[PDB]
Symmetry: C5
Subunit: 310 residues, 5 copies
């Protein structure tokens, strides 16, 4: 009959989230309890009731006694894992207690940036058993798994945490146990509000303020400068995300500004051409409509973006 293995995992720190590379790094602790009757012993007088071992000596003892150990792996681990503590404790009845402290990076293949920056994401860590379920079975340790209090993350806010068990067939035809830890997070909007939304609205407001001078050439020149400013803003924004194959809300928002600036340039050019041919009265008649059509275009664009994306 297969033997039971109890698994527990806790996350202490979140050292960083890299959305450009779609990965994250944490500092955590692992606890495992496993009982093997063949490791039972009787303590001599003057000796402690529990024995302490290093990992190498414990492995050598297991090899000498020819006992199979439950090898496992981190399925979505990336790069090198730095170990701080690896301790072994053995009781008289054969129960083995193991502790592991580490820092490592893990893959996050569930990213979706369609609703950026109003998006919510999922992160997980998978622990897989190598041997099939007819030799070892995973069980959930009680009272240890979860997330810490001083995570240190400034931008992301955790919403929920869950754990469960499942199976896999990575290396054997038969099923093997898998342990899963998951959590969800969302984003703060203060940085985006302070750095992106306000400057664009201020530039648009000043450009519309300048329209009361009734200077078509000056309007054309200002719109031409604002087009380059918007292009620079788009190029700056594009550097924070991977080269995705789909269009996002921010990109649509910038393209709308591009289109509106182009339309304003065309209208001002037409008004100047009308003025140049002695139709100043017609230009003055159409100027009120030209001025009043400016904010409604942006309002309609915002409404259209909301309808399309939400």
């Amino acid at each position: 009959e297969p033997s039971d293995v109890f698994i527990g995992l806790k996350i202490d720190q979140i050292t960083g989230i890299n959305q450009k590379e779609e990965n994250f790094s944490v500092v955590g602790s692992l606890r495992i309890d496993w009982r093997q009757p063949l490791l039972a012993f009787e303590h001599a007088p003057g000796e402690p009731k529990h024995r302490t071992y290093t990992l190498a000596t414990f492995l050598k003892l297991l090899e000498e006694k020819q006992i199979r150990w439950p090898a496992f792996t981190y399925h979505n681990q990336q790069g090198r894992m730095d170990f701080q503590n690896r301790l072994i404790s053995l009781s008289e009845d054969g129960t083995v207690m193991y502790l592991e402290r580490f820092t490592s990076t893990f893959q996050a293949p569930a990213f979706d940036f369609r609703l950026f920056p109003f998006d919510n994401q999922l992160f997980f860590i998978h622990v897989d058993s190598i041997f099939p379920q007819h030799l070892f079975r995973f069980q959930e340790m009680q009272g240890f798994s979860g997330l810490g209090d001083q995570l240190g993350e400034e931008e992301w806010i955790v919403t929920e945490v869950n754990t469960h068990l499942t199976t896999h067939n990575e290396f054997t035809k038969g099923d093997a146990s898998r342990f899963v830890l998951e959590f969800h997070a969302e984003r703060h909007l203060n940085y985006y509000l302070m750095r992106i939304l306000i400057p664009v609205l201020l530039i648009i407001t000043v450009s519309w303020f300048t329209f009361f001078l009734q200077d078509y050439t000056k309007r054309i020149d200002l719109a031409g400068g604002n087009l380059l400013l918007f292009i620079a803003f788009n190029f700056t924004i594009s550097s924070d995300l991977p080269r995705l194959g789909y269009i996002t809300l921010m990109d649509a928002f910038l393209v709308g500004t591009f289109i509106i600036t182009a339309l304003v340039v065309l209208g001002n050019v037409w008004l100047r051409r009308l003025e140049n041919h002695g139709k100043q009265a017609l230009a003055r008649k159409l100027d009120i409509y030209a001025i009043t059509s400016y904010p409604l275009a942006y309002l309609l664009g915002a409404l259209t973006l909301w309808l399309l994306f939400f």
Copy 2:
């Protein structure tokens, strides 16, 4: 007679592709099966039918029994390889099973950027045997080799995967076995369409829109600004590729814009000089041709680029 060695390799993650340095990094697993009759044993009562070893103990046992092992290497490996699991399993008949999990970077010397960004590339991993074929022979393990489902790559799309066997003579006069895994990939165009093509066309469209004002000096000034804008665009684009010895489609596309801007400047200067000498009627007569010659030049340039490159 030589002994048979079965080889299998699977790729789980693609952590990144660096076209500037022409290399890529993956996370994969290696499986090898090899049978040696001299390692046969009989299990004692109460002991498992299979024995588990660490790598060092297995190597020490092989050295004590004086048995040659099939050493191999990754031919195109670059840098340090980080190992996560290295496990050994031995059966009673002498069959050895080996598992290896790693993360590493590999060279990609087959890059070709002539059709960038409409290019398709090839990637491969080579496994080479050190000893000649009269001692060991490689064989293909069935049902293990291939690529995973959750690769995590956002820009590249895999098209096909193949494996085969060949030979090499790196260290011996005689032939030695080689195992090859290959795949092809292409590129998404959404990022390029959103970031490069649209702004240039919009700038050209606005510059041609401004031509209806009939202001030669303003046309000259706008063209002069657009030349600097195009130079900045070219400098920004050049940073994503190595310093190649051949010209690409994007570079030709930018040079065409340079040439067209220069021609527009020359034409506007000639028109202004004609106007300054009392030939305003001649300038107005030629203005229609000057305006109508603008988009045909770009159309002819696009056609010429298509003819030259495709």
Copy 3:
């Protein structure tokens, strides 16, 4: 009865403080004294009164004698720790002396940027015992703990240093000892004064100097350029801090400049519109008020910022 463990920690160098990632790196030394009567020995003639061991041999000796050692860990350690010296000295009465030299990075979750750049911060290092207090108890070594003289930090100035003891329940239901070292630091203002405050004031002063020309259009153009300059300054400043969820004094200072520039643009546009309709006398009458209202707005904004934040 539990045995006493004496702990001492000293910091020699501060190699860097990364406020963007909220961590710091140091070079330090650790000293521990622990007495075990079971390790007593008698020296043979011709041999020294003290014995020197490497860490591995000492651990092997402890395992052979089956003696539990007081395992510990750095709670807020991040990444890999590089060890330079790990020495063991044993006396005849069983007293063990241990020395450890290392370089490592530690988490700083107590950062607060609300008063930046007039802020004061706290840094700490935690040492935790794994076994509960009924087996081992931590004690404070005298005359060793503190900070060095040649720290090498150029921007931060240390104000005070303290040490104390506390408890934790990370791995056991019972309490376990904890050792804490803390210090506070503040910031130099010369860099900020030379790089930020002076250029903005100079630009504002030159913009107000230009007001005596009585040219509304030139004022509008200069204000439009200064708005872009201020936007560039804000974008440059934002890169030195994490994407915080709250507003800081520098951000408020930049937003005030944005608002004042917008108001100046609006006022100049209104004056130009008044002049265009034959109300030049009214514009000249209001010009004195328009000129005199410029510095009072900045003075009131500075006063309001001081009231809000201090």
Copy 4:
């Protein structure tokens, strides 16, 4: 009498050349053959005629037999060297065969940038014996040393490869053997032609095109803008090279453009001052000379640079 040591070294990949730091990184293989009669043995029946060892076991065997080994070092190695394979093979007559695969970075102190970008450089790798020549002597292995075919370098082209032997006195009064591998390389000019030469010539051509409008103020403004453009180009160029103590051809080329722009500004200012005083006829008379003196200055500057540097 000293024993002979045969040395061979081959380079498989060139992973990068860093001219800013003056170093390069490669992937290579090392082969050594050495015969020691004290290691002779007789094979038992059923055992192979050659024995395979790991490095640690071979070193332990040598220490047990008390045999000195020929220690060596890479003289110009920088940083850590990553080893992939380290294999030992021993024959019955005592001949030892060694293989080593590595990736590492090496110093390049022979750089000279005076003729940049028309320069040719030298690279080398030095292998030094620690013990003097009265104990060991190096010999050249035949048929192994050289460079591979798939180097992967895109910018540099190899011209020749050579090997030889010499001596050194790094650690002993007597001479010790040294093995040297050298090669030369030159640079591709397509990148420089496409990115540097064409834009500058186009800007100069457009600036000279604008001279036919007969507008001194516009000429002054255009020259003032081009001066800033050239300054930006110089600052961009300077980042690709170390802070050298001597002047290069590119720097002289940029300084010539600076000087010519300054002279053009001075001439245009003088012409405008002449026009302002009623000397428009004199200004028109001198305008032909002013226009015709523009390209001859650049031609003379190019000739002078060629004379000075070549």
Copy 5:
């Protein structure tokens, strides 16, 4: 009585100097000679007169014989040290010879940037003995210490090198030996002359050239542009140094230019205001003084900077 330990240290390469982080990295070699009569032996026939050991075997032998070894450390070492060779040689009389090759980074807390870029700096490496002087004493090995010939540094020039001995009390109440190696270096000025001094002087010269047009508004506009250019130059310069708490010569030089530009703007505004009120004769009378006061201000500023700093 204490035993004598001979120490020698040589530096082969200088791989880089980081003034922003105030550290430097080198490649060097260490040689130590120490005699212990308890390690004497007699060679058997057929064996060499000297024995070769690895570090681990030598340490195990010392532990078996229970002999204290002179442990040492690099006091100002930062980060991980990469070892290439660690060799042990023992003679029949008990003399031990040790060799160590390494690459590492060291702290430089003696930096002073007040006279930048005309500054001269000091660098040192400290080797400290752990045990007090009543057990071991350091001595200076003759003919080994110093610096190499092919250092590879391009910007810094070494002026002198010295060695000496001193004491410390880092870990014991009694004194312990210390070995010190020091050298001084200065900076090349070609890079600064070519990149900083020339462009600023050229811009100032062109701005003063433009003054002969007698256009106050154009002077104001040019000065306004040059102010932004100088601000950009200051921001670019500030990135090469740490955020120091004191003002440097370059910063004072840039602030002087700021002040002079502001004064020029004020003077031009006053002249324009005088002209606008029918005082063109007064403006023309004061124009000669305004023109002649330009270079004397810069000359006086340079003299004042020289007086203040030198």
